[PDB]
Every structure is written in C-alpha cells, then in structure tokens.
C-alpha cells in the first residue's frame, strides 16, 4: 500500500465471490486440461502417422527406375 | 606341358563381352528369325554359354578370368547382364551414384557378392 496506489501481489486471484471458489476454478482446470488433451490428440494423429506413411515404401519405386521389362 | 614342367597359370581378360551379343543382335533379324523379348535374339542364353563354357579351369591347368560386362541404360535387369550373372564367381557391380559423389572406385558393397 501506498499513498495513491495499492497493489495486491497474489498467488492465486479469481474475481468470484465465495469461499467455494474451486468449484469455478475446476472449470479453467478442465478446460485446458482438455486443450492439452486433444493437441496431443492432434500431434499424433496428424503428424507422426502420415509423415511415416510418405516415407514408408518410397525405394520400391526407386528401383524399378531403368527398366523396360 | 613341358617335360620336366608343370602345366602355367594362364590369366585371361576380356573388355565388355556385352559386345559379344550386341554383335549377334544385329545381325540376328538378317539371319531370319523372330526377335525376342526386348530386342535381342532368340538363341542369346545358348550362344552366351555355349562361349561361356569354355573359359573353365580342368584337371590339368587353370584360368583366371577378368571380365567387364557393360550394363545397357543402367539397368542391372536388361536381359544380357541379367543372363550373365550366373556364369560368374565373384561379382563386383559399380554404381553410378557412387562415382557422381566421388568415391573412387565406385564398386557397390551392397550388390558385390562371392562364393569365397
């Protein structure tokens, strides 16, 4: 506190009014905790699989370059 | 054999035997016959072995051959060099991947191969 200006440093503020306030906290939690979820849903899904896929079977094309049977 | 002696080791090297039956092929449609698969002449594994054959080492005397089989269009399938495998011992394939990237010699240690 200062003469004109208080400044409150806090570890955890909500804006809501009651003690129970973790049951509106809860609700941030699960939100970005299902965020979380489906970017890793995501990562794997989108990237890890087809990027594998293209370079899967890529030399037996190679190999048959030349030839005219 | 000389008398008193025994019989001499006999190298022999030969430069693209691929020639060989490139020259039968042009003149095999001239001598009458269907060509076959690709281009070339119906009788190419019997005239390939019948030459073939003779380069073997006997009872009295050895041979030791060298010999540069040229591969048509870098095609290791191509009829000719496909034929040609299995007469050999010890075959050593070059790459040309390997020579454009500057090692020298070129030989592929994935394709070379021996009974030995």
Redesign the interface.
Not at chain 1, 66 to 69: G, K, T, V, Y
């Given at each position: 506190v200062q003469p004109h200006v208080v400044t409150v440093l806090a570890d955890t503020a909500i804006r809501a009014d009651n003690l129970d306030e973790a049951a509106i906290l809860e609700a941030r939690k699960n939100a970005e905790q299902l965020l979380a979820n489906q970017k890793s849903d995501l990562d794997s899904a989108a990237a890890l699989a087809a990027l594998a896929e293209t370079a899967a079977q890529l030399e037996t094309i190679r190999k048959i370059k030349?030839?005219?049977? | 054999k000389d008398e008193n002696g025994k019989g001499r080791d006999v190298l022999l090297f030969v430069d693209n035997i691929y020639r060989y039956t490139l020259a039968g092929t042009e003149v095999s449609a001239l001598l009458g016959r269907m060509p076959s698969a690709?281009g070339y002449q119906p009788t190419l594994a019997e005239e390939m072995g019948v030459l073939q054959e003779r380069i073997t080492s006997t009872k009295s005397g050895s041979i030791t051959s060298i010999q540069a089989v040229y591969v048509p269009?870098?095609?290791l399938?191509?009829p000719s060099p496909a034929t040609t495998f299995a007469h050999l011992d010890a075959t050593v394939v070059l790459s040309r991947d390997i020579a454009s990237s500057g090692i020298y010699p070129a030989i592929d240690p994935l394709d070379s191969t021996s009974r030995q």
């Open positions: 030349n030839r005219a049977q | 690709v269009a870098d095609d399938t191509d």
